[PDB]
Amino acid sequence: MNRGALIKLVESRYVRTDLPEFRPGDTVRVSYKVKEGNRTRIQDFEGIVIRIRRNGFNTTFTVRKVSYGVGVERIFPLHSPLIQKIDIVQRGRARRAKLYFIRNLSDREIRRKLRAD
Amino acid sequence: HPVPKKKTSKARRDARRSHHALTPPTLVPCPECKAMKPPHTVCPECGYYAGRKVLEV
Amino acid sequence: MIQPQTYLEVADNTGARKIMCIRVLKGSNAKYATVGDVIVASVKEAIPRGAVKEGDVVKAVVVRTKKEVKRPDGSAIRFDDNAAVIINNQLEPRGTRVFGPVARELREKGFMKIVSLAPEVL
Amino acid sequence: RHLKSGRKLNRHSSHRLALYRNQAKSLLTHGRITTTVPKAKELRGFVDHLIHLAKRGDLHARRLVLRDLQDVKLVRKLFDEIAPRYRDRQGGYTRVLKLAERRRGDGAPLALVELVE
Amino acid sequence: MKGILGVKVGMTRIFRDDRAVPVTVILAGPCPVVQRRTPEKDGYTAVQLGFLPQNPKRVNRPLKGHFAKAGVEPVRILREIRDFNPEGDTVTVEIFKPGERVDVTGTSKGRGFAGVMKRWNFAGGPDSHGAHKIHRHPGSIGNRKTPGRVYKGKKMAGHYGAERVTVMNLEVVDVIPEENLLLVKGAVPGPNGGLVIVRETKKAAK
RNA sequence: CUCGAUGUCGGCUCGUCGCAUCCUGGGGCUGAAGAAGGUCCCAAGGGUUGGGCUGUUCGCCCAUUAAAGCGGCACGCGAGCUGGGUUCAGAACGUCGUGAGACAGUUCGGUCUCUAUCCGCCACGGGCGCAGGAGGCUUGAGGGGGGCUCUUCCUAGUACGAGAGGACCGGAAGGGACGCACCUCUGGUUUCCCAGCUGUCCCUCCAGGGGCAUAAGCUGGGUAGCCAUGUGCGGAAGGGAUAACCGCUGAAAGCAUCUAAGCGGGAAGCCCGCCCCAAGAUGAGGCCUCCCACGGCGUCAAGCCGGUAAGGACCCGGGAAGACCACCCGGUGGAUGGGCCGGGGGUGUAAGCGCCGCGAGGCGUUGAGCCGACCGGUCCCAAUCGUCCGAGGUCUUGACC
């Protein structure tokens, strides 16, 4: 019973699936739109593209910093169910080894290297 | 560096040695033969509860 | 994420996108040039011409790197540390500047100009 | 800091694994062996999992625990010698049990523990 | 205004248009195990239990203390004053309405025995120009002829975990009437999967 | 007193009281319009930042700040550090000296020990007791913890106002500092969780592994626990007495006065309200349930033995509780551990055979493989068997049967 049980439950309650979207993939830079908004309920299907970085897993989870070269390096981290989300579509490839936090990217990247993977 | 001052008599020495004190050893009889057995154990005789597997040679 | 003494980045009319702040402009007990805050500093880095100089202003907090945790559980981090220089009132320093969007900023609000100003990629 | 603690052991992880093994081995040899209180306890947990693969029974499994004990004689010795004998129960193939005395000089409480027939 | 509970675990949730985090309160439902009538204990109040751990295990006394107004077969019990029992059995399946403010407490997870380091704030001493104590150690303790000795009540090393305590206001967030559970966004006062209680006081004028 | 011995500076760390109170408020006063100053009496509540240079505390300077106080305790702190210091020999010169040597002129280095006995503080236990013997729930006299404050915004520029200038009532909002808990989330760890790697001796050559390459060789990530830089919360109300200071009713001073008389106003302070201890408060125990008034002994039986498993202790086995200990749940009519199993979350597609390349390896079966503390199943194993102690429960008075 206990924890596992009851809790599993309440969450199931609220989050339900984070909106069946189960497209994780390690690599894949990809793109989405979160409601993220302010100013006159300007909740905007805002879409950021980002090279897939990491994640938290259980009730509460999060599609991690996918780093995005904006013109400086900006990495974007976002909670998974987090009703906050609407569109979440992949573009990139779910490839590469050593598993996540492979910031190798954000760090010494270098477009070339980037592609080097 | 900090050698006390004297010794509050055997008196004290005791106070201490005293609360100290030496208790005794737990025991009942062999679930098998006789003598003293501390809770879960066997010995140079009975030696078991399900297969002496012990004693005599 | 924060700092007192600091080698920070900017990109306004900068002498150099870098100045060292003393501390936080908030509630007398600084300890955090924090995201979306306002604080104190002088220049560290050079400055071709520019009316900027090797002085000291105060201004407002951009980027950080160690958790931009928002109200909506919006989350982010840029491998960059920089804010925009202020002229008194706050009224920003330069005509433009190299950087972009995201809540925290506008949210602090007082600086809409920065707001519309740094938009696109970079 | 410390309190809520799992897998509880002494000496040094290398020393330990060292033992766990050496012992797991010697027992495998004799069915039953004599050592100190937890020596047994944990040794149980371990030689324990080993017999678990002993059972596993297959080219791979074999490959593994061998990975750990290093040496055919036993390798097979267990894997087929008794692994069958057990393959059918629900683990706990360990019988850890408190002897009659305590080693000298100290009074270190000891016992015999073995494959539980 | 009081709930008796088996504190579950802490977890995150969402509200309005934003996530935030809560905690899992669970309580079958204590019952009038004992009443201090006032003429009884002019410190008038209600004592209750809220579960049941094995019956084959149970002192006679317990058996009949229960006998009293007779109720069930548990062991979790305690008391609180100035709280009527407009019932003779309570659950919370409503007992505790959400969108309300609460106060609550519980057992306090059990620390260890760490000095100036733990126990109190300020992490020890310093480290380098001095290492015959490297980084931290005990502050100072009194003096020559001031009081002429060693003080009597400043913080101190050691055991500072095996105790109990509570938290002031917190939010009632949500009510799950079935599995007698409630999410409250709380300082998980003390462990979880263990013991706690809630009470509500706050004539607080903002 | 001290030379059978009292470590002097500066600083550190933990500070403790004090008011001639700095910020706080309460105030009468103004040369007080507002605002803002400034002028005294009341009141320590909390609070009473960073750096710079200087061995200097003082100090001067940078930036803020509500504010960034004076000082008591051998200018608190060596049995708790530090030791630049000035003050053992060096050597330095600058300076006296006929020179030996010297200068509270200076400058470079310059061997600070500490196994606690006492009373004292921090904790945790063993007694023996608060006259039945018991399992458990309480109420607190009395003691402890925290009581700050910004700036903005709310009523704000109608108070003042010729005009230039600025609101009490009061009301918000967030923040800093700080105290109390706590991991979901955020990030930190994770000596074995997983994964990659060189060198090397070993297995059996090949792979597939194995110890050593510092108490894990290297590296990249990594639960769970513990933990900030992450999260909730808190510093309230509000009740009653009052400080300065304001008044009512009223004489003695046949007009007057707050003034002994009698009544009221009033401070972030005092008692409470807030949490945390607590009858070893011998002045409780109050209530609940329950075994029997337990059984034998020289009357005074407040001694013995069984009495009760009334209950508990012992040993065992388990615990975010934990040095030991006591606390806490359990012992097989159980799930308590470990085991196993299902599952989470970890690693990042194994081992082999198979498919393209002279080869390097590449692709397939593979997101496989292998896994420690996290939810929980199932007696697979080990919680067997036993033992001992524990009413006939203070004195006293009154009442009933």
UniProtKB/Swiss-Prot annotation, chain A:
Section of the entire sequence shown: 1 to 117 of 146
Molecular function in Gene Ontology: structural constituent of ribosome
Function as written in the Swiss-Prot or TrEMBL entry: This protein is located at the 30S-50S ribosomal subunit interface and may play a role in the structure and function of the aminoacyl-tRNA binding site.
GO cellular component term of the entry, any: cytosolic large ribosomal subunit
Encoding gene (name): rplS
Domain of life: Bacteria
Keyword list, A-Z: Ribonucleoprotein, Ribosomal protein
GO BP: any one term: translation
Name of the protein this chain belongs to: Large ribosomal subunit protein bL19
Curated annotation (Swiss-Prot), chain B:
Any GO BP annotation: translation
Gene Ontology MF: a single term: structural constituent of ribosome
Gene3D superfamilies: Single helix bin (1.20.5.640)
GO-annotated cellular components: large ribosomal subunit
Region annotation Disordered: where it falls in the sequence: 1-27
Lineage: superkingdom: Bacteria
Cited Pfam families: Ribosomal_L32p
SUPFAM superfamilies: Zn-binding ribosomal proteins (SSF57829)
Amino acid composition bias (Basic residues), ranges on this chain: 1-20
Keywords, sorted A to Z: Ribonucleoprotein, Ribosomal protein
Similarity field: Belongs to the bacterial ribosomal protein bL32 family.
Listed PANTHER family: 50S RIBOSOMAL PROTEIN L32 (PTHR35534), LARGE RIBOSOMAL SUBUNIT PROTEIN BL32 (PTHR35534:SF1)
Role description: Found on the solvent side of the large subunit.
HAMAP family found in the cross-reference section: Ribosomal_bL32
Assembly behavior: Part of the 50S ribosomal subunit.
Protein's recorded name: Large ribosomal subunit protein bL32
Organism encoding this protein: Thermus thermophilus (strain ATCC 27634 / DSM 579 / HB8)
Source species taxonomy: Bacteria, Thermotogati, Deinococcota, Deinococci, Thermales
UniProtKB/Swiss-Prot annotation, chain C:
CDD domains linked to this entry: Ribosomal_uL14
SUPFAM superfamilies (alphabetical): Ribosomal protein L14
Keyword Ribonucleoprotein: yes
Subunit structure: Part of the 50S ribosomal subunit. Forms a cluster with proteins L3 and L19. In the 70S ribosome, L14 and L19 interact and together make contacts with the 16S rRNA in bridges B5 and B8.
Role this protein plays: Binds to 23S rRNA. Forms part of two intersubunit bridges in the 70S ribosome.
SMART domains with a match to the protein in the record: Ribosomal_L14 (SM01374)
GO molecular function, one term: structural constituent of ribosome
Protein name: Large ribosomal subunit protein uL14
Entries under HAMAP family matching the protein: Ribosomal_uL14 (MF_01367)
GO biological process: translation
The species this protein was found in: Thermus thermophilus (strain ATCC BAA-163 / DSM 7039 / HB27)
This protein's UniProt keywords: Ribonucleoprotein, Ribosomal protein, RNA-binding, rRNA-binding
Similarity comment: family membership: Belongs to the universal ribosomal protein uL14 family.
Highest taxon of the lineage: Bacteria
Name of the gene encoding the protein in the UniProt record: rplN
GO cellular component, one term: cytosolic large ribosomal subunit
Curated annotation (Swiss-Prot), chain E:
Primary role: One of the primary rRNA binding proteins, it binds directly near the 3'-end of the 23S rRNA, where it nucleates assembly of the 50S subunit.
Keywords of the record: Ribonucleoprotein, Ribosomal protein, RNA-binding, rRNA-binding
Endpoints of the signal sequence: none
CC per GO annotation: cytosolic large ribosomal subunit
Assembly notes: Part of the 50S ribosomal subunit. Forms a cluster with proteins L14 and L19.
Keyword Ribosomal protein: yes
Keyword Transferase listed: no
Record HAMAP family: Ribosomal_uL3_B
Protein name per its UniProtKB record: Large ribosomal subunit protein uL3
NCBIfam families to which the protein is assigned, alphabetical: L3_bact (TIGR03625)
Single GO biological process annotation from the record: translation
A Gene Ontology molecular function term of the record: rRNA binding
Family: Belongs to the universal ribosomal protein uL3 family.
